[PDB]
């Protein structure tokens, strides 16, 4: 029981390139995507763990 649940929702994510069509096919257990995102790549960064305030 993790967080009052014996079930598991394994998530997945893919990037779809322009000119490419993705196809979802299922007959159950599919957690449907509702909100997708269109982004432009910023190469060369990371993520800093911090409690510091913003200014």
């Amino acid at each position: 029981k993790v967080r009052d649940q014996e079930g598991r929702i394994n998530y997945y994510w893919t990037l779809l390139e322009p000119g490419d069509t993705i196809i979802f096919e299922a007959n159950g257990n599919l957690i449907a995507p509702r909100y997708a995102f269109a982004l432009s790549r910023g190469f060369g960064s990371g993520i800093i763990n911090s409690n510091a305030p913003m200014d």
């Binding site: 990371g46 993520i47 800093i48």
Partner: protein, 173 residues
């Protein structure tokens, strides 16, 4: 004291001379007082400022980052990640701190030069009109007014004018 002047035969830095890094103190009839030398000083400030600017501004830093998180099952790579950081923090630390001492002793065996450089111009300007006291000074064998003093500091000191009076007092001694 490589050249042997700084902490050499000139055993004392003058707390009173604040116009520059090198200068002269004269003592004659008209009075006394320190005076700093700009030809020697300015050539040193400008060169050192640039020597500082040198090491500062040759570390080209690209817009990058370090913080990488690895899954618990890429520990070999997570270990590899640290090795790539520690190796730089190994190198850039060693090379820097050794460079500091170097361009420290290289900066102390530069001021010692220019002090010694200055001495062998004033000493090679009078050449027998004064007997060297050894602590970094001269005793003129002749009366030298402030107009004569100021030529010694400039670089246009007159040897023929004050030479006839020099031999009559050097003969006394």
């Amino acid at each position: 004291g490589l050249f042997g002047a700084i902490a050499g035969f000139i055993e004392g830095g003058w707390t009173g001379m604040v116009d520059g890094w090198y200068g002269y103190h004269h003592q004659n009839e008209q009075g006394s007082g320190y005076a700093a030398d700009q030809k020697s000083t300015q050539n040193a400030i400008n060169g050192i400022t640039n020597k500082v600017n040198s090491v500062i501004e040759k570390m080209n830093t690209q817009f990058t980052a370090v913080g990488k998180e690895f899954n618990k099952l890429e520990r070999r790579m997570e270990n590899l990640n640290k090795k790539v950081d520690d190796g730089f923090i190994d190198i850039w630390t060693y090379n820097a701190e050794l460079l500091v001492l170097l361009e420290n002793e290289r900066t102390l065996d530069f001021h010692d030069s220019n002090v010694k450089n200055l001495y062998e111009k004033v000493k090679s300007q009078l050449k027998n009109n004064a007997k060297e006291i050894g602590n970094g000074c001269f005793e003129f064998y002749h009366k030298c007014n402030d107009e004569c003093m100021e030529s010694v500091k400039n670089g246009t000191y007159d040897y023929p004018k004050y030479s006839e009076e020099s031999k009559l007092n050097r003969e006394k001694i």
